[PDB]
Structure formats: C-alpha cells, structure tokens
Amino acid sequence: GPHMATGQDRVVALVDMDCFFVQVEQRQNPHLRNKPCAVVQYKSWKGGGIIAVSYEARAFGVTRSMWADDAKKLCPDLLLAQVRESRGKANLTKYREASVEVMEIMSRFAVIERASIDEAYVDLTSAVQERLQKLQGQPISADLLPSTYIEGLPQGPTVQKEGMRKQGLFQWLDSLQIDNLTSPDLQLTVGAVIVEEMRAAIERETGFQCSAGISHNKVLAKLACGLNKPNRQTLVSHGSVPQLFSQMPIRKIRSLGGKLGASVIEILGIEYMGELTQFTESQLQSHFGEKNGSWLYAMCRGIEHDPVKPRQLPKTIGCSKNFPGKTALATREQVQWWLLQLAQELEERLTKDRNDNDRVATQLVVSIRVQGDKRLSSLRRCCALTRYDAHKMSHDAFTVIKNCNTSGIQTEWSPPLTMLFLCATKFSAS
DNA sequence: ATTATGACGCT
DNA sequence: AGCGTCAT
Ligand SMILES: Nc1nc2c(ncn2[C@H]2C[C@H](O)[C@@H](COP(=O)(O)NP(=O)(O)OP(=O)(O)O)O2)c(=O)[nH]1
Ligand SMILES: [Ca+2]
Ligand SMILES: [K+]
Numbered sequence: 001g002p003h004m005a006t007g008q009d010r011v012v013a014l015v016d017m018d019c020f021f022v023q024v025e026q027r028q029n030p031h032l033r034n035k036p037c038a039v040v041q042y043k044s045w046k047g048g049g050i051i052a053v054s055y056e057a058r059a060f061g062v063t064r065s066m067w068a069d070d071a072k073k074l075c076p077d078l079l080l081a082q083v084r085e086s087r088g089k090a091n092l093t094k095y096r097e098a099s100v101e102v103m104e105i106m107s108r109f110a111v112i113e114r115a116s117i118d119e120a121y122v123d124l125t126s127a128v129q130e131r132l133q134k135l136q137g138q139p140i141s142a143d144l145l146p147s148t149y150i151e152g153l154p155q156g157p158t159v160q161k162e163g164m165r166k167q168g169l170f171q172w173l174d175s176l177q178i179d180n181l182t183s184p185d186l187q188l189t190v191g192a193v194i195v196e197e198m199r200a201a202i203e204r205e206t207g208f209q210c211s212a213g214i215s216h217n218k219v220l221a222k223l224a225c226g227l228n229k230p231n232r233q234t235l236v237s238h239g240s241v242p243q244l245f246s247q248m249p250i251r252k253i254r255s256l257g258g259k260l261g262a263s264v265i266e267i268l269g270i271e272y273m274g275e276l277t278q279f280t281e282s283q284l285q286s287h288f289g290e291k292n293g294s295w296l297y298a299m300c301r302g303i304e305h306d307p308v309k310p311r312q313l314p315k316t317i318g319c320s321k322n323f324p325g326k327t328a329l330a331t332r333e334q335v336q337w338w339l340l341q342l343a344q345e346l347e348e349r350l351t352k353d354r355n356d357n358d359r360v361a362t363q364l365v366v367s368i369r370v371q372g373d374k375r376l377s378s379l380r381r382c383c384a385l386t387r388y389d390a391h392k393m394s395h396d397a398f399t400v401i402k403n404c405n406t407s408g409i410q411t412e413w414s415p416p417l418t419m420l421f422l423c424a425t426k427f428s429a430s
Numbered sequence: 431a432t433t434a435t436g437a438c439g440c441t
Numbered sequence: 442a443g444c445g446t447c448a449t
Binding site for chain 1: 431432433434435436437439
C-alpha cells in the first residue's frame with residue numbers, strides 16, 4: 001500500500017548508437033551513406049565476419065556474426081567496410097576514438113556509465129529536478145519530444161507510424177499532472193526532453209544518430225531503448241510495465257538471455273517476465289539464489305536498484321586474437337611473435353590511455369585457449385605490469401604460460417594455441 | 431573457422 | 442586469484 005516502494009525514485013536513460021561501426025565508416029566515406037552496408041573483420045575466410053549492419057541491410061536479413069559471402073547471397077549490392085588491420089590483427093582504434101567523442105558529449109548533461117563501446121547509462125534524476133524548477137509548472141509541449149515514443153500508447157479509441165507516435169504522445173501529455181513536481185511520470189517526461197537535447201547534440205556534433213530509452217532504472221531503460229530503433233527514443237513508465245511484461249519473453253531482459261533465463265523458464269514452467277509476479281521472493285531465491293531471486297522478484301514488477309556508476313572510461317584495456325583450426329600456433333617462435341604483436345598494440349593503447357586519463361595499469365592478465373577446449377579461456381594467469389614496454393610484457397606473458405606447453409621438444413607447442421589475450425587491469429591514478 | 435573485447439559474479 | 446556467465 002502506502003509503504004510498497006515502486007522503484008520510481010530515479011530517472012535513468014540508456015543511449016545506444018545505431019549500427020555504430022557502420023555509422024563511423026559512413027561518416028568517413030559518404031559513398032556508404034543511406035545504403036545497405038556492413039562492417040567486416042578480415043576477408044580471406046568466407047569474406048570476413050560481419051560485426052555491424054546498417055538498417056537498410058538488415059531489411060535483407062543481414063546480421064551480425066554472418067559471413068560476408070553469405071550476407072552477399074542475401075543482399076548482392078551490400079557494401080562492406082573492413083576493420084583496420086595492424087600487426088597482423090584487427091585494430092579497433094577508430095571506433096574507440098569515435099566512442100570517446102560521443103561519451104564526452106553525453107557527459108556534459110550528466111554523469112554516465114560506459115556500458116560498452118557505444119552505449120551509456122545516464123542518471124538524469126538531478127537534471128530533471130533542475131529543469132522542473134525552470135519550467136515553473138509550465139506544461140510540456142509535444143514539440144519538445146519530436147522523436148519520443150510512449151510505450152503502450154495510444155490505447156482505446158491512424159494509418160502511418162509517425163501518426164501513431166504522435167497520438168500516443170498526445171494521450172500521454174494530456175494525462176500529465178504538471179502541477180505535482182514529484183510525479184514520476186512528469187519526471188520521466190522531463191528526462192525524455194533532456195534526452196532529446198542530448199541526442200540532438202550528439203548528432204549535431206558528431207553526425208551519429210542514436211536511440212535511447214528513458215525509464216526509472218537501467219534494465220527498463222535498456223529494454224525501452226530497443227523498442228523503436230533506429231534514431232528514436234522510448235519512454236517506459238512504471239505504469240506501462242504490466243502490459244509490456246505480460247508478453248515479454250524472459251530472455252529479452254539483460255542478464256536472462258543465457259543459462260539462468262533458461263533455468264527460470266524450465267524450473268518455473270513460464271515464458272514471459274510478467275508470469276514471475278506470481279512467485280514469492282523466497283520461492284525465487286530458493287530456485288535462483290539470494291541475489292538473483294531478490295532481483296527477479298523486483299524486476300518483474302519493474303523495480304531495479306543497480307546504480308548508474310560514474311565511470312566514463314573502460315576498466316580494462318585488452319588485446320586478443322583467435323587462431324582457428326589450422327592457423328593455430330604450434331611453435332615457440334610463433335607464440336612469441338604473436339604475444340609480441342599483441343603486446344605492441346597493448347603498449348600503444350596503454351601509453352595513450354596514460355596520457356589522456358592520468359592513470360596506469362598495474363596487472364597484466366594473460367589468457368589462452370588450447371586446441372580442443374570449447375571454453376573461451378583455457379587458462380588465465382596474472383603477473384605484475386610495472387612498465388609500459390611491449391617486449392617486457394610479451395616476455396612476462398610467455399613466462400606465465402610456457403608451462404602449458406605439453407611438448408617435450410621445447411621448439412614445438414602442443415596442444416597448439418587457438419587464442420591469445422593480453423589484458424591490462426587494476427588501474428591507479430598517476 | 432561468429433571475433434575482439436568488456437563487464438561482473440562465484441568461490 | 443582463477444574460472445564462469447553474459448553480452449554482442
Ligand atoms: N569486434 C567486435 N565488435 C563487435 C561485435 N559485436 C558488435 N561489435 C561492435 C560493432 C557494433 O557497431 C558496436 C556496438 O555494438 P551493438 O550496439 O550491439 N550493435 P550496433 O551498434 O551495430 O547496432 P544497433 O543499432 O542494433 O545498436 O560493437 C563483435 O562480436 N566483435
Ligand atoms: Ca548500438
Ligand atoms: K550497444
């Protein structure tokens with residue numbers, strides 16, 4: 001009743017760049033703009049692997065993880081841009097730099113959490129309080145929300161999608177109580193005004209378009225962001241959650257797309273998020289553990305407490321390369337040469353990070369996969385990272401992995417290595 | 431032979 | 442500390 005907290009205390013947005021790597025390449029090369037196009041890494045094996053797809057190309061069925069040769073079967077006029085290669089490997093520097101552009105613009109409006117190379121959470125609670133004091137109880141015009149969808153509207157008592165969007169927005173706005181400066185729906189609406197401004201700034205100052213979700217927590221903001229891509233933003237109110245969740249497959253919610261979500265489905269015999277409401281918190285905890293159970297109990301009611309961390313920079317800086325099938329590394333010289341290539345990219349990125357961001361990594365994590373192991377990592381060993389020197393780092397990585405070499409002959413490497421991964425972690429201010 | 435990462439939980 | 446999960 002009056003004591004049942006509703007998780008409406010914060011305004012949180014999730015901003016995600018549309019087809020990011022594609023937009024980066026389309027900005028650089030105007031010939032790619034407004035075309036079916038994709039970004040690929042490598043080329044020799046089946047045309048390279050696609051990692052980003054323009055919405056025009058998505059209409060033909062082109063997806064991430066598909067081989068370019070197969071994508072061209074679906075879309076023969078598909079245009080392709082390849083990731084840069086340096087020291088024998090993919091080099092994603094261009095996209096990391098573009099990410100910094102976007103992240104710095106977002107940081108002007110509020111503290112952000114960098115969730116991935118092209119998406120960030122935004123805690124707008126305080127900014128919304130400020131804008132509400134400025135408005136002085138003035139209603140919010142639809143002209144202030146020109147790309148916003150209100151999830152679940154229109155409802156009740158009309159042919160084209162922009163007309164739909166506007167009807168829903170008008171129903172939402174006419175129902176607003178702009179008198180109460182503590183109304184959560186009003187707070188979300190003002191948050192959406194601010195996100196319109198942030199998205200306008202990103203597009204004006206970088207050329208990049210993005211989608212966004214506005215809700216009361218990170219999971220709902222993320223789900224909202226996905227509802228109307230590309231180049232649009234969606235407000236998911238607390239009140240919209242029962243209908244939204246009533247037909248939402250469990251796997252669509254961030255963190256439930258894997259084994260845990262499959263176990264929720266199998267153990268409880270349910271399919272949709274909303275079905276979780278019928279279980280007690282203790283029941284959920286008994287199946288899925290304390291933390292998961294409390295989280296599911298709150299989440300299926302639209303409530304989640306995970307804070308937006310004030311973290312604009314990545315916590316780790318890593319370099320990895322797969323050596324699949326017959327390219328696997330089977331000689332000591334091979335393993336040393338590739339460890340050195342990775343360590344050289346790592347040194348470059350670390351040196352630039354230290355100059356930009358006034359910090360130094362102190363731990364080097366070395367991960368490998370051996371042939372036949374289906375796991376991502378077959379082995380992970382750490383050592384100290386005392387100097388940004390590639391030869392040092394690569395020699396140290398070899399020292400921590402060399403006992404994995406089954407071969408008695410210290411010139412061969414068996415079983416051959418199908419992945420190498422160097423990761424700098426545990427940063428300290430410098 | 432979806433690849434190159436990046437986050438975070440568990441013990 | 443090393444491993445597993447999730448993500449994409
Ligand atoms: N190296 C690599 N990069 C990847 C991979 N997957 C994605 N990226 C890169 C390429 C992506 O551009 C970028 C951001 O990932 P998303 O947000 O998941 N996809 P996008 O922004 O393209 O589409 P949407 O409009 O649906 O948000 O990360 C991968 O497996 N490997
Ligand atoms: Ca994106
Ligand atoms: K993303």
